[PDB]
Write a structure and sequence with these properties.
The structure is a homodimer. By secondary structure, chain A is of the alpha/beta class. The first copy, chain A, is built from 28 helices and 22 strands. Helices cover 49% and strands 11% of the residues of chain A. Bound molecules: adenosine-5'-diphosphate (2 copies) and magnesium ion (2 copies).
Chain lengths: 802, 802
């Protein structure tokens, strides 16, 4: 800029200069590889690899690495990277966004940093929007990476896990943002370590970040899976349950335990023909629904704990007394209550797993992306991913003529007008490209064109290859191309034979999109490196953008002033007005992302623990130790509840506790009055943990030393998986129900955090307990195989911006 | 923790261990300084200083540095830092929060990192809440710092700028958060570089961060100053103006210029007896009000640009047509319009300067703070200042008994009850400390105590020294102390003679504060390193905390259940309920800070430019270059407006532009038709910039070579200062008026950003222009002294949480 205002430019200027100098240091040694041998150059990779093991940094080997790559390309493709492209690669290396105007060769640039970071062999994900480009780039760019002798994988959904694994095994991988995501997702629902496809997230280079990180980032990734019409279980459970009402079927006033174990419950339960007493098949599976249905009656009371309704069952916020917006009870106790109250029980798809692009890409050791349009939301990138946008210079100065948006009083005037411009160019040789924003628009003008006898091609985003074929030639003399939402993104238009002197491309925007960014990408398609072009925008007072800006008063002045008379008008001020209109739209969306993120941050934290513990359970050599850590943490909880806030030491209630452990961790008489008397809550834990240890021991020598190691893993996964999957579905429900009935004054997100954490807290407890219960009591019958908890088929999708 | 949940603890555990090992590496070399000479030890500082110049890092010299400090203390104070205190210092060094429970010696700990970071001589700010502690700490802690031979300053408001400068000159400075802030503030309204007191922000160690960074952070710092009843000026301006209506007083249809320069305007203006034509006295000052009043009539039209009202004048959002919430016109053009419309013109204090504690402390190369209570809002610290809370272990294990909050159905039951507990302890020797939360509470119980014949002391935050004196002994046998909002914070209570066996302190909380954090600080005062104590909280159903949680339903159950009968009750669940009540309160406040911050972030960005340019103008050796950069950027703007979006090249309007420059940059005929013809907007800029250069030159050889260097600085400061101060006041207005009339759907903050940036944009333009105008046209008369723009006295204050 000029004058004062030029200091906002300072943080960019300073960096840009490092990068300029460096690009030069690179061009200096153009000689060092210029004349060399194909195989000598390949040995460079190795030299670097060695040099790295020794202790150097990617930053140290950067210049040379880039020089090598630079040579490698000319050799392979015949293209020798520009000084600007070198600057871009570096930017990328420094973990930033390389704003390199559409057509500066962002693809080739990726190679440099990609190559250099790939050397540690840690892996690099180069990502794009669609499977066409992904496969396209991999193929063309791979030949340089492979020449320098580096493995190159391509991940698509149509690939077996084994195929996927091989793709990820590569020194470098190409894939869609969606594939990456979903993979990470499925990757964490795996039963055995070897089934995961992904390798640790190292570095990701996102081609066209704005699209990925911004647009495709309005909603999250989900994996659903239904329940097998199970209803019949709860019905039967509820029925059965209210039978054995006696204290030969125990309960807790303190812990709220529905202790079935008694022979009344047991024997009369096995009577239900549960293939007798097979605790490991049954108890994990069937005895779960029972223990719920039991509590549902005993512990849960109609209008003190919950509430019955026409909208079904609600929870009552204790101590405030409220209709709990959207919250269900854990592990399907909600269903057991409905059965007990006869209400229709619901069985929808459960959300098995979820993460947001934002929280995903955040997961890498390093991220970087490239695109032409980004400074627009530099505030966002810098904020969320800590990537600063760097506007890389152009190779050749721009000479394209960007024309001021033309305004109209009607859609029909506007549209009808566009058809003429096309005509004029058409009848001169000028190749035209018209950008619509929706299907209808693109076909409306199609009619207007065929009517006027102008031959044309229409792109409406399907098998991008087909369109790409079409679009590449869209820059020839009789080129008349219609693009619905930049349908041929990434593929560049080269100025046709003789078209050079015909003017240039001359693209034409039928309207403006909700983002400058996107209508600016439209602009982008002309002037491909010094090439000439014209860009014309068309708008009308009856446009959605307009009639959403509350622009009626303005509509009236024109009308009242007979302005629809002079019709094609250019008011810098009205264009500025739409500029703000856009900024607002964008602002709203940024707000939407900002929110989506926040609700998930609550999740990511929860995932950190789970995911990690889960993984822990799969590198399961020495598992027992955790299993005991968990039994002990379950046990401690019992003790501390029978010994509340110092409520009279040996005057606690040292005889329910006694009878409990004795009945839920051990099997009747073993723990009694005497055993634990005159001991602090701490003293007691160890005493009995010890007798649990004694018992745990016993089982290793009675049911298989190392089979148990798997018993443990099975139980723990069964536990974790079952609990977790639930809580998540639960958490997805809450996240969109809390937005209902909330005069609480607080921000919902707040409630969410608080309530979310709470349940989580619970689930941990639940898990630890289930684990302890089974490992101590559960009985081995046949094959102790780690078993799947997902019922039936799954579905991996991204919802619609709703 | 135990069980699964223990992985949230991982990011803390990992760091805590580095710190434990290190503290040990330190204790290893206890011998190395153990036996040494007082003066040999002092030479260590030097050794380090040298060692540093050479190239070592504070991190490298840490152990030794700490060892030295550790020795230095025992020698000086006789206190040899605990392994825990060493861990704390490190934490601080790593730029984090050292959560070291109240009484772990946070003061002594500060020395270590303080010392070590001070060595570069870059400076260290150690900060606290009040001037007592600040002076106290400086004095006691200084003796160790000074022993190791390091300069130690103390900043108070009662100190001359020269005193302040000396305090800041020190290797280390102690001061209140408020003083620091205000200083930075005043520091940027300085006319000559040498008047600033502060030195570049290096490292700040905040004692009791939570108080500073959180509580004292709900509102911002302001500096106001009124206007000298000037009204008489605008009145006269408005009157005068509408006289010379002729084109011997020019205007612009394109630039909206109220060009007075003409002899009609000039001569008939000097007629107003403006001591003739003294352009430099008058034009800067008086001719400003004229040029406004002029535009007010010509350019500003009653109901197209603005609107008249009973609430005075409003702007009309162009192109949407709206009542501009809260926005005034720049440089007092708003006043000129009111005068032209006869409305009462307003003269309130203007907000001269502002920053938020958050955006201030953010300004350091490094920040760190210590306190007992912080994990509470670890999310905040980690977020805003990128400081992770580290809970440092206790030296000696805690044996204090924290009792479950006691609940009552009345304030009177609750209060009356508290007076008895006091009685019981009093009549046993137990020293009591009762925490109230407001003045009234503390005196209510005072009566209840004097009535019951129990002698007591009441603290209600005044001359903290006086209270500190009182409070230190508040731990003796007949100690009965009443603290309004922890009135004796920082000063620690030592267990009196024989009190050891009497139980301990036994503090008693009359109610709970809006933050656990604060009622937890109350708890903190007992058990000072293994010392015993009891902590009792008291609450009632008729408490504000309660009746803000919408806890009426709950009030009723008790009542309906005859619960006010059994009266003193402990429901873990109701205490949990208040826990949430607090979390909510806190959550609301965090939300309040989060917002305050955001509105200021818009500001900080603007400050970055201004502040920087201002400073630039004061290291004013080679200024001209900027002055031309600015004239040129003003000029470019004119050209580009007379040559709009390619609107027919030599068919622009090359003859108004011509006559303009010729009249606003130059003085009549010099620039004409021919001069600029057949030239691109770019070609023209240089042509004429050159003739401006020719003219600029002339003045250096006609009115003083280097006097001009000061002319330049004077003009530029006059400009900057005048414009800026305004815009800021303006910006403070907007920030609290935009919250009115806003159905716009967008979030206000958004509008604020957009509108804020806009005006800023304007002011830059305004500045550049004023500068150019004067430097080229303005005439030297007498003393060209940099002159103050602040009118009359100033006022530096922090508003109340409103
Ligand atoms: N160093 C180079 N030398 C010659 N041509 C290049 C070079 N780099 C890229 N190109 C060409 O320019 C076009 C732009 O590349 P592309 O990968 O599509 O980047 P962008 O995303 O910027 O349009 C490509 O079709 C390619 O053939
Ligand atoms: N290393 C030490 N050895 C003996 N006493 C110490 C040591 N460090 C601090 N103390 C004492 O313990 C008290 C706590 O110190 P203080 O600065 O008030 O810290 P805090 O903020 O944690 O209460 C001080 O009064 C001091 O006299
Ligand atoms: Mg591309
Ligand atoms: Mg202290």
């Amino acid at each position: 800029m000029l004058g004062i205002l030029n200091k906002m430019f300072d943080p960019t200027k300073r960096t840009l200069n490092r990068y300029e100098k460096i690009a030069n240091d690179i061009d200096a040694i153009r000689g060092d590889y210029e004349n060399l041998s194909d195989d000598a150059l390949k040995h460079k990779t190795i030299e670097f690899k060695e040099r790295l093991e020794k202790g150097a940094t990617t930053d140290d080997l950067l210049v040379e690495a880039f020089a090598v790559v630079r040579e490698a390309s000319r050799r392979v493709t015949g293209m020798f990277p520009f000084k600007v492209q070198l600057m871009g690669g570096v930017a990328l290396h420094d973990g930033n966004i390389a704003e390199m105007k559409t057509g500066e060769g962002k693809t080739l640039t990726s190679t440099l940093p990609v190559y250099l970071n790939a050397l540690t062999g840690k892996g690099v994900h180069v990502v794009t929007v669609n499977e066409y480009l992904a496969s396209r780039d991999a193929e063309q760019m791979g030949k340089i990476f492979e020449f320098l002798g580096l493995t190159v994988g391509l991940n698509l959904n149509s690939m077996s896990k084994d195929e996927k694994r091989e793709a990820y095994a590569a020194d470098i991988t190409y894939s869609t943002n969606n594939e990456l995501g979903f993979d990470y997702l499925r990757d964490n629902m795996v039963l055995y370590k070897e089934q995961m496809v992904q390798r640790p997230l190292h570095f990701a280079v996102i081609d066209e970040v704005d699209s990925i990180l911004i647009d495709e980032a309005r909603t999250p990734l989900i994996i659903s899976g239904q329940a097998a019409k199970s209803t019949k279980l709860y019905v039967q459970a509820n029925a059965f349950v209210r039978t054995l009402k006696a204290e030969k079927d125990y309960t807790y006033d303190i812990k709220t335990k529905a202790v079935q174990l008694t022979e009344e419950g047991m024997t009369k339960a096995e009577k239900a023909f549960g293939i007798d007493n097979l605790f490991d098949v049954k108890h994990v599976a069937l005895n779960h629904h029972i223990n719920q249905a039991l509590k549902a009656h005993v512990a849960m009371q109609k209008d003190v704990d919950y509430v019955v309704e026409d909208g079904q069952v609600v929870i009552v916020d204790s101590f405030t007394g409220r209709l709990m917006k959207g919250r269900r009870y854990s592990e399907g106790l909600h269903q057991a209550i409905e059965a007990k109250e006869g209400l229709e029980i619901q069985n929808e798809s459960m959300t098995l797993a979820t993460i947001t692009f934002q929280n995903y890409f955040r997961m890498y050791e390093k991220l970087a992306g490239m695109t032409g349009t980004a400074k627009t939301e530099e505030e966002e990138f810098r904020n969320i991913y800590n990537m600063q946008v760097v506007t890389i210079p152009t190779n050749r100065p721009v000479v394209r003529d960007d024309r001021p948006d033309l305004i109209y009083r009607t859609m029909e005037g506007k549209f009808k007008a566009v058809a003429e411009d096309v005509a004029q160019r058409y009848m001169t040789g000028q190749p035209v490209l018209v950008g619509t924003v929706a299907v209808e628009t693109s076909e409306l003008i199609s009619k207007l064109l065929k009517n006027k006898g102008i031959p044309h091609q229409v792109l409406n985003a399907k098998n991008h290859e087909r369109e790409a074929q079409i679009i590449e030639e869209a820059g020839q003399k009789g080129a008349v191309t219609i693009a619905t939402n930049m349908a041929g993104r990434g593929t560049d238009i080269k100025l046709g034979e003789g078209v050079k002197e015909l003017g240039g491309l001359a693209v034409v925007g039928t309207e403006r999109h909700e983002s400058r960014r996107i209508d600016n990408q439209l602009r982008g398609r002309s002037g491909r490196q010094g090439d000439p072009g014209i860009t014309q925008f068309y708008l009308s007072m009856e446009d959605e953008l307009m009639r959403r800006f509350g622009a009626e008063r303005t509509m009236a002045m024109l009308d009242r002033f007979g302005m629809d008379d002079s019709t094609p008008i250019q008011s810098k001020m009205v264009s500025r007005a739409v500029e703000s209109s856009q900024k607002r739209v964008e602002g709203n969306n940024f707000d939407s992302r900002k929110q989506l993120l926040q609700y998930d941050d609550v999740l990511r934290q929860q995932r950190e623990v789970i995911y990690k513990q889960r993984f822990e359970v799969i590198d399961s050599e020495n598992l027992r130790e955790i299993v005991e850590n968990m039994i002990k943490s379950s046990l401690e909880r019992a003790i501390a509840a029978y010994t509340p806030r110092e409520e009279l030491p040996e005057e606690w209630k040292l005889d329910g506790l006694v009878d409990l452990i004795n009945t839920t961790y051990l099997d009747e008489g073993a723990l009694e009055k005497s055993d634990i008397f005159g001991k602090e809550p701490d003293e007691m834990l160890e005493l009995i943990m010890d007798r649990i240890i004694t018992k745990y021991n016993e089982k290793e020598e009675q049911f298989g030393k190392e089979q148990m190691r798997e018993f443990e893993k099975v139980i723990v996964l069964r536990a974790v998986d079952s609990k977790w999957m639930d809580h998540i579905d639960a958490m997805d429900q809450l996240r969109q129900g809390i937005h209902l009935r909330a005069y609480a004054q607080t921000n919902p997100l707040r409630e969410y955090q608080m309530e979310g954490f709470a349940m989580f807290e619970h689930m941990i407890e639940s898990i630890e307990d289930e684990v302890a219960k089974f490992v101590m009591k559960a009985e081995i019958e046949n094959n102790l195989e780690r078993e799947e908890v997902v019922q039936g088929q799954t579905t991996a999708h991204q919802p619609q911006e709703g």
